[PDB]
Design a protein around this ligand. Sequence first.
Ligand SMILES: [Eu+2]
Lengths: 60, 60
Amino acid sequence: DDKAACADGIAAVKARVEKLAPEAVPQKLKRALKIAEREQGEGEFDECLEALDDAKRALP
Amino acid sequence: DDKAACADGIAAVKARVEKLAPEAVPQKLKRALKIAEREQGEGEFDECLEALDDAKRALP
Ligand SMILES: [Eu+2]
């Protein structure tokens, strides 16, 4: 469901980000991940998924 | 728009709540107002309006 997909999506995006050099991680990508995590913690798992879509678009 | 309606709705609901005795204000009403304010601060003015609908249903 959206809760599982949000948790798995945060893990998947972070796994890709952890392949980049830390000094190569765009601020917009960090911000989008933080928004997804905030929404996950609020129980807005649907909103988390939409923020994860933004994070993927920020991947270099 | 949703931003103005959220701000006005927070003010309207609070105005009604401030007519109750403070020891008569249900916890669920306080919680719903706090959620609406959190969502307003996040810029989720649409979500704020949906939380305000819950707050109105919590009015005694
Ligand atoms: Eu939210």
